[PDB]
């Protein structure tokens, strides 16, 4: 019955706390019913058949990313008028669209926001949080809590006015651009983080004299490698750890390996700050 404009404003505010009740039986399922409560408020009175829709919102998984869930919310909002006002019969396909947009959007949203957004802003605002005070943990909170809000408001509004017809339309071509541009920024930044923002030092001396009236002209192994490239050892360690992780080893079982190495290597002069 003509979902009011302010009702979309309501679904936006009620979708901020989307992730549940993140269960294991029905992940985010209750969070979807909670996000659609305001729609069902003015869409229906208290009735047997009119209030069985909350049953179908629980009917199965809805396990996608919290941020790419605004297009799905807007599409499923639009589907309700065609079932409430237009009365165009549709029962299974409402969940059909949920399941169909579960798949691609779970794999195109994870390598962006947990991909080149969270650890790129978390890296911009953490090279500053070391030295600085409030330009690190504040360039994060401002710049990341905007990109998540421009993905939710412009998600719901722009996925509500456009029904099914432009789900199959922008589901081809645009997201390939958006995830090929993401994994260029996130690869350019991660190449720099591995190089500069890691510390590895090898104090093994390999050369004597020590000319020029007592300068000792010391040249440890770190100078030999810094003659080639000033970040080589962390680069190789990254490819070792990057190879281990495909074998699904726990990252909490590779960190302990490094904790062992940092003790057994500093007690033999191999590693040392």
């Amino acid at each position: 019955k003509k979902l009011t404009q302010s009702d979309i404003r309501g679904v936006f505010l009620r979708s901020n706390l989307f992730q549940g009740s993140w269960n294991f039986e029905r992940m985010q399922a209750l969070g979807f019913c909670f996000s659609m409560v305001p729609a069902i408020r003015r869409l229906y009175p208290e009735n047997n058949e009119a209030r069985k829709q909350a049953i179908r919102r629980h009917l199965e998984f809805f396990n996608t990313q919290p941020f790419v869930a605004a297009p799905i919310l807007g599409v499923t909002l639009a589907l309700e008028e065609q079932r409430a006002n237009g009365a165009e019969i549709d029962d299974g396909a409402i969940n059909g669209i949920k399941v169909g947009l579960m798949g691609p959007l779970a794999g195109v949203g994870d390598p962006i926001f947990w991909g080149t957004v969270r650890p790129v802003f978390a890296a911009l605002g953490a090279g500053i949080a070391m030295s600085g005070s409030l330009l690190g943990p504040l360039l994060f909170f401002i710049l990341f809590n905007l990109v998540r809000l421009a993905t939710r408001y412009y998600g719901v509004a722009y996925g509500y006015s456009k029904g099914i017809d432009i789900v199959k339309d922008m589901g081809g071509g645009f997201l390939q651009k958006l995830t090929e541009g993401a994994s260029i920024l996130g690869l350019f930044v991660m190449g720099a983080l591995v190089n500069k923002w890691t510390h590895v030092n090898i104090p093994l001396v390999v050369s004597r004299i020590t000319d020029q009236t007592g300068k000792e002209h010391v040249t440890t192994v770190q100078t030999i490698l810094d003659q080639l490239m000033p970040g080589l050892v962390p680069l190789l360690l990254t490819f070792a750890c990057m190879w281990l992780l495909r074998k699904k080893v726990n990252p909490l079982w590779i960190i302990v390996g490094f904790f062992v190495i940092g003790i057994a290597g500093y007690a033999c002069g191999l590693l040392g700050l």
Binding site: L17, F18, Q19, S21, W22, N23, F24, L30, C33, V37, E46, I55, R57, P66, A106, P119, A122, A123, L124, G125, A126, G127, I128, A129, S133, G136, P137, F140, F141, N145, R148, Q176, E180, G181, I184, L185, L187, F188, V189, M190, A192, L193, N195, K196, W197, H199, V200, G231, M242, L244, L245, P251, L252, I255, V256, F258, F259, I261, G262, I263
Partner: protein, 247 residues
């Protein structure tokens, strides 16, 4: 040392940074905001912000992906600053002690997520009748039970750190081990990077890795400058690459 009007503030900040552990929107599930917020309430602010900066570099690539629960950087970043800001310790000791806490971490937040099922088995009984208020106060009520299991172990600590039993058992490390963990603190961070690069790895985009690698060795850009050059390069690559031009 710690006064009763600081315990409550630490408790509330832990509750806020316990809401975010599952909620994953405003990102208090991050060792940056959850660390400055504790540093402000407990005491000096710079020595908490530094912990925050150091702890994210590990906590990149600590995401949840489809019932693969992350090591919970939300509990490992509140106990790990009370044991530095409040009790008389060093940065690298807290960073090293965070890892077992992060292991506590998902063990706790998996039991909580598993026992949350009773909030949906009590949700269908509400959808069968209405109204939706029975749902709008059941979805939130499952959020006041996870924030009370990242904020209670942050009061058991901040009331037991203030004793000689722990404050003297934390000095027989010894000092040889401590300096051996400030050295692993430049190495363990690499794991956090490898998990990220494994997500965004395309064989034809790896040239942009080794390009952002070399330009870091021999140039003095920031990470803002390296994050702007990255987006300029990405936009121009998408602008070229006739895959987006024609058939």
């Amino acid at each position: 040392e710690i006064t009763t009007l600081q315990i409550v503030l630490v408790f509330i900040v832990a509750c806020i940074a316990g809401m975010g552990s599952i909620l994953d929107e405003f990102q208090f599930h991050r060792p940056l905001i959850a660390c400055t917020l504790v540093g402000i309430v407990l005491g000096d602010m710079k020595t908490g912000i530094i912990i925050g900066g150091t702890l994210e570099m590990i906590a990149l690539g600590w995401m949840n992906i489809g019932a693969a629960v992350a090591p919970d950087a939300a509990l490992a970043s509140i106990i790990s600053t009370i044991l530095v800001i409040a009790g008389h310790q060093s940065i690298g000791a807290g960073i090293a002690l965070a890892i077992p806490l992060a292991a506590a971490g998902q063990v706790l937040t998996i039991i909580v997520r598993t026992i949350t099922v009773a909030f949906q088995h009590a949700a269908d009984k509400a959808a069968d009748n209405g109204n939706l208020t029975a749902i709008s106060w059941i979805h939130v009520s499952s959020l006041f039970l996870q924030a009370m299991r990242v904020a209670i172990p942050a009061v058991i600590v901040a009331l037991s750190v203030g004793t000689s039993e722990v404050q003297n058992m934390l000095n027989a490390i010894p000092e040889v081990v401590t300096n051996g963990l400030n050295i692993a603190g430049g190495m363990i961070v690499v794991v956090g990077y490898a998990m990220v690069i494994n997500m965004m790895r395309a064989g034809y985009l790896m040239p942009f890795f080794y390009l952002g690698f070399v330009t870091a060795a021999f140039t003095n850009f920031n990470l803002v400058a390296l994050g702007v050059i990255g987006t300029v390069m990405a936009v121009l690559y998408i602008q070229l690459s006739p895959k987006y031009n024609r058939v």
